[PDB]
Amino acid sequence: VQLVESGGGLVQPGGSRKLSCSASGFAFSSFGMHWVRQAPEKGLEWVAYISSGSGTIYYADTVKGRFTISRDDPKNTLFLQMTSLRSEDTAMYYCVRSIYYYGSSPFDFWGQGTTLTVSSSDIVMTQATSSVPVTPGESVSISCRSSKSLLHSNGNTYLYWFLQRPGQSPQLLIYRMSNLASGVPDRFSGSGSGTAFTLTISRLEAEDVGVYYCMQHLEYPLTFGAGTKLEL
Amino acid sequence: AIRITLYAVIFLMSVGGNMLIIVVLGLSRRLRTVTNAFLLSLAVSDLLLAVACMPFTLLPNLMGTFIFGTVICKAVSYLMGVSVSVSTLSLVAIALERYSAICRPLQARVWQTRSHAARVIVATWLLSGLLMVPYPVYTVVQPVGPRVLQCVHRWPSARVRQTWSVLLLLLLFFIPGVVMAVAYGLISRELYLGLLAKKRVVRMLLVIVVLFFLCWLPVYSANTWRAFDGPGAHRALSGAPISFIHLLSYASACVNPLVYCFMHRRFRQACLETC
Amino acid sequence: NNIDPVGRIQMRTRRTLRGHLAKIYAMHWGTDSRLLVSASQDGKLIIWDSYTTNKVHAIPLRSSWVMTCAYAPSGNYVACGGLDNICSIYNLKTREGNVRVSRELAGHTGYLSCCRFLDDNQIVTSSGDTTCALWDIETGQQTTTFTGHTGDVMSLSLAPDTRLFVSGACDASAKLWDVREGMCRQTFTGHESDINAICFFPNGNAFATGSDDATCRLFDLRADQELMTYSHDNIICGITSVSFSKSGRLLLAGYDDFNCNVWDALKADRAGVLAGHDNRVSCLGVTDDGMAVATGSWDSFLKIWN
Amino acid sequence: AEDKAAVERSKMIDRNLRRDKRDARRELKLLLLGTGESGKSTFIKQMRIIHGGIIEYPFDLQSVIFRMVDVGGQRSERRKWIHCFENVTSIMFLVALSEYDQVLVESDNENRMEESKALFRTIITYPWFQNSSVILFLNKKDLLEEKIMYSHLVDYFPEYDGPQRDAQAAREFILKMFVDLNPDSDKIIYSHFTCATDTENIRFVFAAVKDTILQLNLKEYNLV
Amino acid sequence: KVSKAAADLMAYCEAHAKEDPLLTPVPASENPF
Amino acid sequence: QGPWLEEEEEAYGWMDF
């Protein structure tokens, strides 16, 4: 029901911290944890991944070796130890719950998010527009591009859409470009080719005006782009 | 003499009888068990023991020379050591599996399975390989006389010679003998205490232990006899007595699939359907 | 006959699915063609991923004597039963992530033999207390009860049209029951022994039954007669599982003789043999589109035959 | 894909359940079988209290973790769910020892021997002999002389040739006759003598399952 | 009557034989096996 | 036939198995 994060504060660049994602209300042992972080003005970018039960620990390619993390499974906690903190790591960290099987919904429920403000080959996705003003009731299409044909031989596209309402977590909207997520209404619909993708938001209402986000998931690194803001 | 005839008969009996064990234990119509897998290990060990030792020991006593090369004799020496070690350790292991199967049977039902059987079989194979590493590297050939290829095993220090001899006598004969004896004694004790066929089982156990002791006593006592007495001992023990002393262990190798598989009723009836 | 032969079809196990610790009694396929459920007497109801050879979920059961599996057409729930008289409904797609029990359907006085998810929230269960019952998940009680059998009911078949189900009993009666009105439409008493397993046509016009005398008897609805039987003289072992093809041409029949004798619709010939199991074939099913065939036996081994 | 890491370790989870089921492989399908009014529940609560629908009873102990499968009740055809119980180490069965002469609970109430003859017919119908070792249990022996005395024993029992109209010895001969009506002598039926309130029942079943594990270990280790 | 249900069976088998992967073997391109 | 020893007190052994 509730995921709480801790470990924020004001530390000089070059310090050490302990981020802690405490989780409750679900069987945390059979879930995989992501650690998407957000720049205060630039979009999301992925940091780390751990499979269910402390197995295949993944990382972003530039922070491979510099971050260490463990999971306390009997108490349902994540211990992200922060070492050699740089000035470019001012971010809003999220704690992402995902599960991987057939017919699953990864990236379904997201953490609340804690801040971290310090003073002073690779598939890359890109957005279409940084900000689009749309009055509600116009069925806006938001598109995104990539650098690979995400039409893997198993028969599904590893594309995950999102939405961040201003202030709280970026909840999932569309997974596998055609399957509607849990907790969202029956008005969103995704489409796209092998490389280019699009998302139709029909009959817009209140509160679905946050910044949108898109994800490739075919390889281990994960790229978001700048994020399409939706305006009025 | 009678050596070539009795070696021919024990060749046909051992190789043919073990071949039936190999073909029926290789396939499994839900018949494989802990003892069936361990008897498969005993069968491959005894088959390798027969094909490696029986002709390549009889011919040096009769012909006096190996026709084949020295690397053949190195491979034969490794086969001697690994086949003897796996055969005796397989006997100990089958005795211990039966020991746990009757003494504390609940713990064995907890802790014995097919994966445990294969794990212990690989353990005896790897430990027999690992402990006996210097055996095939000290079997270089010294030619003696005009043309005799002996390929005798040489250890330089007499202390090292007698230490390896007494260690082979202890760890590969004495502890196997006493563990086999006390295990089958506890089998008989719980067979009579818990409860006709029990006399048949007790006779089977007694004849297995006394047959193992009687057959494997002369080769180990002969190795210690070279280790201690040295000169003069080789003069008295040469030719035919060496052949018969090895032949007793050879008879143990041929009777092990006989007494463990063939003489038992169920395995004979099961072999009837396979043929 | 007039129909063209399918011939001797060489059928191979593409993927072997191991991980059940004891004898598997029932399996059911999910409707999205990669998901299945299969259960053993260890107390495990396992959701298996078919094409990539995986366990989607492992569900511990308090009832360790389970004889049935049901998978929801929506895919959200599964149903187990067994000797503890209770149809346990487990929710697969939860926020919690663990597959947890939603409702324990108690009230039956006999062993649960075959349950099938009629709808997303409606469940039909056949039991060994001679009666069948349609239950609702939210209420937790029998929506309707199907009494009046003479022998103990052993099998149940899900209607594809979700309107009219048929169940077979021990007293050689295959009775069809309508869900809404709750009364018995048709009785098939022309048999000599128990109905071990039953499976029902994709149209709904026919259904084949499993017996203990190697007769895969088909009975059809509008014909009102019991004439065609699929009897093999060589086999004496009984039919433990019955499943159908999409076209209805090809009959999947798992037997007590540790083989799957696969037959044809009309002329009833041995079409395929799926001999890869040590113990008797207890459960057998196909996907809705028909890519995969799943065979589970008492040897704790589940095999996809393609 | 990335489902692999979820599943392979789920393998060892079942292998943990392979381990724990082997850690409790001293448990097996201890199938209690019985008839009405034989006082099955009395012995069941006796075994629960002294060491303190199908119902499973965990008798966990340092010597033996134990779980007894009560198939009392479950009014249904025996053949279909008896397929489920091939792995039984012991088909535990209660015989109506105490009520020598009673008539069946069905409405006729006039049957001569047909209660005990029906129980004997349930004894006969055994389709699996691979691991079946019936542990026979005797019922209470509190009151003998009146129960033996009021109804004459010999006329009901066709083959019985023993002393009668005596309080103490006839108990011993009728008990030896009931434990001597063992039709299958190739296997071993492990009869025990216990009253309704008599203790040490767990030691009798533990010794009987140890003895049948010894017999099966003799059979399948080629040690016969 | 048996004949009408039988003819319904023939019509349904002849109509839907093509989609069946059991009756018509499928190429291995779609699934890597 | 031919003895293993072809000299005076040489004590030449044989293969152990």
PDB file of N, CA, C and O in Angstrom, chain D residues 126-169:
ATOM      1  N   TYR D 126      -8.253 -54.753  -2.167  1.00  0.00           N
ATOM      2  CA  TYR D 126      -6.986 -54.020  -2.161  1.00  0.00           C
ATOM      3  C   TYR D 126      -6.352 -54.147  -3.541  1.00  0.00           C
ATOM      4  O   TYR D 126      -5.801 -55.218  -3.867  1.00  0.00           O
ATOM      5  N   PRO D 127      -6.398 -53.109  -4.375  1.00  0.00           N
ATOM      6  CA  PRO D 127      -5.840 -53.213  -5.736  1.00  0.00           C
ATOM      7  C   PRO D 127      -4.361 -52.868  -5.877  1.00  0.00           C
ATOM      8  O   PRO D 127      -3.849 -52.951  -6.999  1.00  0.00           O
ATOM      9  N   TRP D 128      -3.667 -52.481  -4.806  1.00  0.00           N
ATOM     10  CA  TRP D 128      -2.248 -52.139  -4.878  1.00  0.00           C
ATOM     11  C   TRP D 128      -1.505 -52.808  -3.732  1.00  0.00           C
ATOM     12  O   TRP D 128      -1.868 -52.626  -2.565  1.00  0.00           O
ATOM     13  N   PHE D 129      -0.465 -53.574  -4.066  1.00  0.00           N
ATOM     14  CA  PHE D 129       0.342 -54.293  -3.087  1.00  0.00           C
ATOM     15  C   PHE D 129       1.795 -53.834  -3.057  1.00  0.00           C
ATOM     16  O   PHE D 129       2.632 -54.514  -2.454  1.00  0.00           O
ATOM     17  N   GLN D 130       2.120 -52.710  -3.706  1.00  0.00           N
ATOM     18  CA  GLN D 130       3.514 -52.282  -3.805  1.00  0.00           C
ATOM     19  C   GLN D 130       4.062 -51.813  -2.461  1.00  0.00           C
ATOM     20  O   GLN D 130       5.206 -52.123  -2.110  1.00  0.00           O
ATOM     21  N   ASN D 131       3.265 -51.065  -1.698  1.00  0.00           N
ATOM     22  CA  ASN D 131       3.727 -50.489  -0.446  1.00  0.00           C
ATOM     23  C   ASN D 131       2.681 -50.629   0.660  1.00  0.00           C
ATOM     24  O   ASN D 131       2.858 -50.062   1.743  1.00  0.00           O
ATOM     25  N   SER D 132       1.596 -51.362   0.414  1.00  0.00           N
ATOM     26  CA  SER D 132       0.544 -51.532   1.411  1.00  0.00           C
ATOM     27  C   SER D 132       1.017 -52.417   2.559  1.00  0.00           C
ATOM     28  O   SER D 132       1.422 -53.564   2.345  1.00  0.00           O
ATOM     29  N   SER D 133       0.975 -51.877   3.779  1.00  0.00           N
ATOM     30  CA  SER D 133       1.280 -52.632   5.000  1.00  0.00           C
ATOM     31  C   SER D 133       0.265 -52.205   6.061  1.00  0.00           C
ATOM     32  O   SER D 133       0.476 -51.211   6.760  1.00  0.00           O
ATOM     33  N   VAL D 134      -0.826 -52.966   6.169  1.00  0.00           N
ATOM     34  CA  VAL D 134      -1.932 -52.615   7.059  1.00  0.00           C
ATOM     35  C   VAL D 134      -1.476 -52.689   8.511  1.00  0.00           C
ATOM     36  O   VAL D 134      -0.965 -53.718   8.966  1.00  0.00           O
ATOM     37  N   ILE D 135      -1.659 -51.593   9.242  1.00  0.00           N
ATOM     38  CA  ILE D 135      -1.428 -51.558  10.683  1.00  0.00           C
ATOM     39  C   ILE D 135      -2.786 -51.757  11.342  1.00  0.00           C
ATOM     40  O   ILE D 135      -3.602 -50.834  11.404  1.00  0.00           O
ATOM     41  N   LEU D 136      -3.030 -52.963  11.841  1.00  0.00           N
ATOM     42  CA  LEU D 136      -4.316 -53.295  12.437  1.00  0.00           C
ATOM     43  C   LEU D 136      -4.359 -52.799  13.878  1.00  0.00           C
ATOM     44  O   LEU D 136      -3.386 -52.950  14.623  1.00  0.00           O
ATOM     45  N   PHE D 137      -5.476 -52.190  14.268  1.00  0.00           N
ATOM     46  CA  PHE D 137      -5.656 -51.689  15.626  1.00  0.00           C
ATOM     47  C   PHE D 137      -6.848 -52.353  16.298  1.00  0.00           C
ATOM     48  O   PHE D 137      -7.945 -52.397  15.731  1.00  0.00           O
ATOM     49  N   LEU D 138      -6.619 -52.865  17.502  1.00  0.00           N
ATOM     50  CA  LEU D 138      -7.675 -53.420  18.331  1.00  0.00           C
ATOM     51  C   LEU D 138      -8.355 -52.319  19.140  1.00  0.00           C
ATOM     52  O   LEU D 138      -7.737 -51.313  19.501  1.00  0.00           O
ATOM     53  N   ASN D 139      -9.639 -52.520  19.426  1.00  0.00           N
ATOM     54  CA  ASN D 139     -10.433 -51.540  20.155  1.00  0.00           C
ATOM     55  C   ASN D 139     -10.370 -51.825  21.657  1.00  0.00           C
ATOM     56  O   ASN D 139      -9.533 -52.603  22.125  1.00  0.00           O
ATOM     57  N   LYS D 140     -11.254 -51.181  22.427  1.00  0.00           N
ATOM     58  CA  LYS D 140     -11.165 -51.198  23.885  1.00  0.00           C
ATOM     59  C   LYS D 140     -11.457 -52.582  24.457  1.00  0.00           C
ATOM     60  O   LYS D 140     -12.182 -53.386  23.863  1.00  0.00           O
ATOM     61  N   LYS D 141     -10.860 -52.858  25.618  1.00  0.00           N
ATOM     62  CA  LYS D 141     -11.053 -54.096  26.364  1.00  0.00           C
ATOM     63  C   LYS D 141     -11.435 -53.811  27.812  1.00  0.00           C
ATOM     64  O   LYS D 141     -10.925 -54.452  28.734  1.00  0.00           O
ATOM     65  N   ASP D 142     -12.312 -52.827  28.032  1.00  0.00           N
ATOM     66  CA  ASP D 142     -12.684 -52.458  29.394  1.00  0.00           C
ATOM     67  C   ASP D 142     -13.675 -53.451  29.994  1.00  0.00           C
ATOM     68  O   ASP D 142     -13.457 -53.974  31.093  1.00  0.00           O
ATOM     69  N   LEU D 143     -14.771 -53.727  29.286  1.00  0.00           N
ATOM     70  CA  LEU D 143     -15.846 -54.577  29.787  1.00  0.00           C
ATOM     71  C   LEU D 143     -15.954 -55.812  28.904  1.00  0.00           C
ATOM     72  O   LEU D 143     -16.177 -55.695  27.695  1.00  0.00           O
ATOM     73  N   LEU D 144     -15.799 -56.990  29.508  1.00  0.00           N
ATOM     74  CA  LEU D 144     -15.775 -58.246  28.766  1.00  0.00           C
ATOM     75  C   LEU D 144     -16.901 -59.200  29.132  1.00  0.00           C
ATOM     76  O   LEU D 144     -17.569 -59.721  28.233  1.00  0.00           O
ATOM     77  N   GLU D 145     -17.107 -59.465  30.429  1.00  0.00           N
ATOM     78  CA  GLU D 145     -17.912 -60.613  30.846  1.00  0.00           C
ATOM     79  C   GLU D 145     -19.389 -60.443  30.491  1.00  0.00           C
ATOM     80  O   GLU D 145     -20.038 -61.398  30.049  1.00  0.00           O
ATOM     81  N   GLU D 146     -19.935 -59.232  30.650  1.00  0.00           N
ATOM     82  CA  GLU D 146     -21.333 -59.020  30.281  1.00  0.00           C
ATOM     83  C   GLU D 146     -21.512 -59.048  28.767  1.00  0.00           C
ATOM     84  O   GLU D 146     -22.472 -59.646  28.263  1.00  0.00           O
ATOM     85  N   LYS D 147     -20.580 -58.426  28.033  1.00  0.00           N
ATOM     86  CA  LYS D 147     -20.681 -58.316  26.580  1.00  0.00           C
ATOM     87  C   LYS D 147     -20.538 -59.675  25.906  1.00  0.00           C
ATOM     88  O   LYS D 147     -21.264 -59.981  24.954  1.00  0.00           O
ATOM     89  N   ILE D 148     -19.598 -60.494  26.382  1.00  0.00           N
ATOM     90  CA  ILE D 148     -19.491 -61.873  25.921  1.00  0.00           C
ATOM     91  C   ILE D 148     -20.708 -62.677  26.372  1.00  0.00           C
ATOM     92  O   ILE D 148     -21.240 -63.504  25.621  1.00  0.00           O
ATOM     93  N   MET D 149     -21.198 -62.403  27.585  1.00  0.00           N
ATOM     94  CA  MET D 149     -22.162 -63.288  28.231  1.00  0.00           C
ATOM     95  C   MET D 149     -23.558 -63.182  27.622  1.00  0.00           C
ATOM     96  O   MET D 149     -24.240 -64.204  27.474  1.00  0.00           O
ATOM     97  N   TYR D 150     -24.011 -61.966  27.272  1.00  0.00           N
ATOM     98  CA  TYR D 150     -25.434 -61.794  26.961  1.00  0.00           C
ATOM     99  C   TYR D 150     -25.813 -62.456  25.639  1.00  0.00           C
ATOM    100  O   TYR D 150     -26.909 -63.016  25.515  1.00  0.00           O
ATOM    101  N   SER D 151     -24.928 -62.419  24.645  1.00  0.00           N
ATOM    102  CA  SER D 151     -25.180 -63.050  23.356  1.00  0.00           C
ATOM    103  C   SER D 151     -24.190 -64.183  23.134  1.00  0.00           C
ATOM    104  O   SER D 151     -22.984 -64.012  23.340  1.00  0.00           O
ATOM    105  N   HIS D 152     -24.712 -65.337  22.727  1.00  0.00           N
ATOM    106  CA  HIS D 152     -23.885 -66.514  22.494  1.00  0.00           C
ATOM    107  C   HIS D 152     -23.026 -66.313  21.250  1.00  0.00           C
ATOM    108  O   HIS D 152     -23.524 -65.908  20.196  1.00  0.00           O
ATOM    109  N   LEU D 153     -21.725 -66.578  21.382  1.00  0.00           N
ATOM    110  CA  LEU D 153     -20.781 -66.217  20.326  1.00  0.00           C
ATOM    111  C   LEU D 153     -20.755 -67.247  19.202  1.00  0.00           C
ATOM    112  O   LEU D 153     -20.640 -66.880  18.025  1.00  0.00           O
ATOM    113  N   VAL D 154     -20.838 -68.536  19.547  1.00  0.00           N
ATOM    114  CA  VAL D 154     -20.462 -69.608  18.624  1.00  0.00           C
ATOM    115  C   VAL D 154     -21.464 -69.732  17.477  1.00  0.00           C
ATOM    116  O   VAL D 154     -21.086 -70.021  16.336  1.00  0.00           O
ATOM    117  N   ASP D 155     -22.754 -69.507  17.754  1.00  0.00           N
ATOM    118  CA  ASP D 155     -23.773 -69.685  16.719  1.00  0.00           C
ATOM    119  C   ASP D 155     -23.656 -68.650  15.596  1.00  0.00           C
ATOM    120  O   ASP D 155     -23.941 -68.961  14.434  1.00  0.00           O
ATOM    121  N   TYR D 156     -23.244 -67.419  15.920  1.00  0.00           N
ATOM    122  CA  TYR D 156     -22.996 -66.430  14.870  1.00  0.00           C
ATOM    123  C   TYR D 156     -21.775 -66.779  14.025  1.00  0.00           C
ATOM    124  O   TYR D 156     -21.767 -66.531  12.812  1.00  0.00           O
ATOM    125  N   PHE D 157     -20.729 -67.340  14.638  1.00  0.00           N
ATOM    126  CA  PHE D 157     -19.452 -67.505  13.947  1.00  0.00           C
ATOM    127  C   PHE D 157     -19.339 -68.929  13.425  1.00  0.00           C
ATOM    128  O   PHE D 157     -19.232 -69.860  14.236  1.00  0.00           O
ATOM    129  N   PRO D 158     -19.341 -69.148  12.103  1.00  0.00           N
ATOM    130  CA  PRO D 158     -19.403 -70.531  11.586  1.00  0.00           C
ATOM    131  C   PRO D 158     -18.171 -71.375  11.879  1.00  0.00           C
ATOM    132  O   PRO D 158     -18.305 -72.571  12.163  1.00  0.00           O
ATOM    133  N   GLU D 159     -16.978 -70.791  11.822  1.00  0.00           N
ATOM    134  CA  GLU D 159     -15.737 -71.546  11.921  1.00  0.00           C
ATOM    135  C   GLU D 159     -15.131 -71.511  13.325  1.00  0.00           C
ATOM    136  O   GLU D 159     -14.131 -72.191  13.575  1.00  0.00           O
ATOM    137  N   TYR D 160     -15.734 -70.775  14.259  1.00  0.00           N
ATOM    138  CA  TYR D 160     -15.164 -70.634  15.595  1.00  0.00           C
ATOM    139  C   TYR D 160     -15.329 -71.911  16.412  1.00  0.00           C
ATOM    140  O   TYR D 160     -16.444 -72.413  16.587  1.00  0.00           O
ATOM    141  N   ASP D 161     -14.208 -72.418  16.934  1.00  0.00           N
ATOM    142  CA  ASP D 161     -14.168 -73.600  17.804  1.00  0.00           C
ATOM    143  C   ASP D 161     -13.294 -73.233  19.003  1.00  0.00           C
ATOM    144  O   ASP D 161     -12.073 -73.412  18.970  1.00  0.00           O
ATOM    145  N   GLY D 162     -13.923 -72.721  20.059  1.00  0.00           N
ATOM    146  CA  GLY D 162     -13.199 -72.291  21.231  1.00  0.00           C
ATOM    147  C   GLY D 162     -14.021 -72.340  22.504  1.00  0.00           C
ATOM    148  O   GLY D 162     -15.241 -72.537  22.478  1.00  0.00           O
ATOM    149  N   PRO D 163     -13.349 -72.200  23.651  1.00  0.00           N
ATOM    150  CA  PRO D 163     -14.064 -72.133  24.933  1.00  0.00           C
ATOM    151  C   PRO D 163     -14.965 -70.908  25.021  1.00  0.00           C
ATOM    152  O   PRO D 163     -14.641 -69.833  24.515  1.00  0.00           O
ATOM    153  N   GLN D 164     -16.112 -71.089  25.674  1.00  0.00           N
ATOM    154  CA  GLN D 164     -17.143 -70.065  25.738  1.00  0.00           C
ATOM    155  C   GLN D 164     -17.795 -70.134  27.120  1.00  0.00           C
ATOM    156  O   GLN D 164     -17.590 -71.095  27.870  1.00  0.00           O
ATOM    157  N   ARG D 165     -18.550 -69.078  27.460  1.00  0.00           N
ATOM    158  CA  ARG D 165     -19.180 -68.863  28.775  1.00  0.00           C
ATOM    159  C   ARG D 165     -18.160 -68.781  29.911  1.00  0.00           C
ATOM    160  O   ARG D 165     -18.439 -69.199  31.038  1.00  0.00           O
ATOM    161  N   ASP D 166     -16.973 -68.244  29.637  1.00  0.00           N
ATOM    162  CA  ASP D 166     -16.025 -67.873  30.680  1.00  0.00           C
ATOM    163  C   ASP D 166     -15.496 -66.465  30.424  1.00  0.00           C
ATOM    164  O   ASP D 166     -15.324 -66.050  29.274  1.00  0.00           O
ATOM    165  N   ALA D 167     -15.278 -65.725  31.516  1.00  0.00           N
ATOM    166  CA  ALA D 167     -15.104 -64.277  31.433  1.00  0.00           C
ATOM    167  C   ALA D 167     -13.760 -63.866  30.837  1.00  0.00           C
ATOM    168  O   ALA D 167     -13.703 -62.917  30.047  1.00  0.00           O
ATOM    169  N   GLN D 168     -12.677 -64.554  31.191  1.00  0.00           N
ATOM    170  CA  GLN D 168     -11.331 -64.054  30.931  1.00  0.00           C
ATOM    171  C   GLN D 168     -10.642 -64.734  29.759  1.00  0.00           C
ATOM    172  O   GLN D 168     -10.056 -64.054  28.911  1.00  0.00           O
ATOM    173  N   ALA D 169     -10.676 -66.068  29.704  1.00  0.00           N
ATOM    174  CA  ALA D 169      -9.945 -66.795  28.668  1.00  0.00           C
ATOM    175  C   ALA D 169     -10.567 -66.594  27.288  1.00  0.00           C
ATOM    176  O   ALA D 169      -9.842 -66.457  26.289  1.00  0.00           O
TER     177      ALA D 169
END
